[PDB]
């Protein structure tokens, strides 16, 4: 997806939908939850690990390397993060993309254009991980084929 959302509120990532009802933003729960559960967990374990020895150049030589050793620990977990969430954005996208399949158009940009009419509890249904391809199959196939 080619951009972020200034209007996002409750969290790091989620969906923005305009249906025959209305429009606007929202975000997920567990995906944002277990995100930080893993992140702050990582943020700790890194710095915690540095310490010193007792594994059973005054400080001038030691220090310069301690730093050099430490500085990179960040340049990692940093790098390992911007990839982490990115992975979680992909994962968000695809979990819907497999769910809907033929039912909605992938215009990309995280965006789907529903062939059928989706309104809430169908929406949240998708979100809950429970969405009926059969329920909406025809409602889709008809509208989709007029296009082609």
């Amino acid at each position: 997806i080619e951009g972020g959302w200034t209007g996002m509120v409750d969290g790091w990532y989620g969906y923005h939908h305009q249906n025959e009802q209305g429009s606007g933003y929202a975000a997920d729960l567990k995906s944002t939850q277990n995100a930080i559960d893993e992140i702050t967990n990582k943020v700790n374990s890194v710095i915690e690990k540095m310490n010193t020895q007792f594994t059973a150049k005054v400080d001038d030589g030691f220090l310069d390397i301690w730093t050099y050793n430490a500085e990179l620990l960040v340049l990692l977990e940093n790098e390992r993060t911007l990839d982490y969430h990115d992975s979680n954005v992909k994962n968000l996208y695809e979990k819907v993309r497999s769910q809907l399949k033929n039912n909605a158009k992938e215009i990309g940009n995280g965006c789907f254009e529903f062939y059928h009419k989706c309104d809430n509890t169908c929406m949240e249904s998708v979100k809950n991980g429970t969405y009926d391809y059969p329920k909406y199959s025809e409602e889709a196939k008809l509208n989709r084929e007029e296009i082609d």
């Binding site: 997806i1 972020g4 959302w5 990532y13 969906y15």
Partner: protein, 321 residues
């Protein structure tokens, strides 16, 4: 009838670093350093440091006359001397075990200056009034350290000299004396009359004998002679003795004291305040639960580990556009 997917672009501007891209801006981060300080030197937990403006520790403790006014106390959290504090040993010479002394005195709970050998009472057979130099001017006239007396032949005889002090105070007693090495044999003879002159000093913790070295050193503050400055801590119970046939610069004032686990000596032109803190730095103080800092190698009390890195910025969250 769409449903889309996107993410947060934060009002927050702080940028961090990655392998493939350095400058990169993010929504969220954390900084493990502390750049920032109150730009002041404070009372450390309610106790003020000691500040010697134009004096360094030596001139102060010796009682250099340029240190006459200065300040006092029974107590100080730490010690601060400025970049500008030049008033040292005005008679040229080496201060001995200086660094060690500096450390003993960083933090003090009780500090009591007493005159361990009264100038009037103590030295009946030697001359206690000649002891001035132009090397140590005060008020436009020849002078000397306040805490020592430069003793000189009364007569044309400089008899043998022994004085003893028992420490009846409650604490450690810091005692300082010095040894005069004059420039020429003639010089030696005028002062002490005795070419053979030696000096001895002793205690439970201390024993040393001294021979002066006559020789012509380069002129400093007009002195071609030298003066070495020595010291010791006499234990509460302990006794200390002094012998000389010459060349000894006798104690007058000494200090009863009880230490604290050492703070440091901060060297800064930073001003003191009535403020307070846990963690003091040459540049300022720091209130942080923070792990580190790039601020100064030298910290006092409970302080964040020093680090030479520019910036440490992790990532709580994603990039933004």
């Amino acid at each position: 009838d769409t449903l889309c997917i996107g993410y947060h672009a934060n009002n927050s501007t702080d940028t961090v670093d990655t392998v493939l891209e350095k400058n990169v801006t993010v929504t969220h981060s954390v900084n493990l350093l502390e750049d920032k300080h109150n730009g002041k030197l404070c009372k450390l937990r309610g106790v003020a440091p000691l500040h010697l403006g134009k004096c360094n520790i030596a001139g102060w403790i010796l009682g250099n006359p340029e240190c006459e006014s200065l300040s006092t106390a029974s107590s100080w959290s730490y010690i601060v001397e400025t970049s500008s504090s030049d008033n040292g040993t005005c008679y040229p010479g080496d201060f001995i075990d200086y660094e060690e002394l500096r450390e003993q005195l960083s933090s003090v709970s009780s500090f009591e200056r007493f005159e361990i050998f009264p100038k009037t009472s103590s030295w009946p057979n030697h001359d206690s009034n000649k002891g001035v130099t132009a090397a140590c001017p005060h008020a436009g006239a020849k002078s000397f350290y306040k805490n020592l007396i430069w003793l000189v032949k009364k007569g044309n005889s400089y008899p043998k000299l022994s004085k003893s002090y028992i420490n009846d105070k409650g604490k450690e007693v810091l005692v300082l004396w010095g040894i005069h090495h004059p420039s020429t044999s003639a010089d030696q003879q005028s002062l002490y009359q005795n070419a053979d002159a030696y000096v001895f000093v002793g205690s439970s913790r201390y024993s040393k004998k001294f021979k002066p070295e006559i020789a012509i050193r380069p002129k400093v503050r007009d002195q071609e002679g030298r003066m070495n400055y020595y010291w010791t801590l006499v234990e509460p119970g302990d006794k200390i003795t002094f012998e000389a046939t010459g060349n000894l610069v006798v104690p007058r004032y000494a200090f009863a004291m009880e230490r604290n686990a050492g703070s440091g000596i901060i060297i800064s032109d930073t001003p003191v305040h009535d403020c307070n803190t846990t963690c003091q730095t040459p540049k300022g103080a720091i209130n942080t639960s923070l792990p580190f800092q790039n601020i100064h190698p030298i910290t006092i009390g409970k302080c964040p580990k020093y680090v030479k890195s520019t910036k440490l910025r992790l990532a709580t969250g994603l990039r933004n556009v």
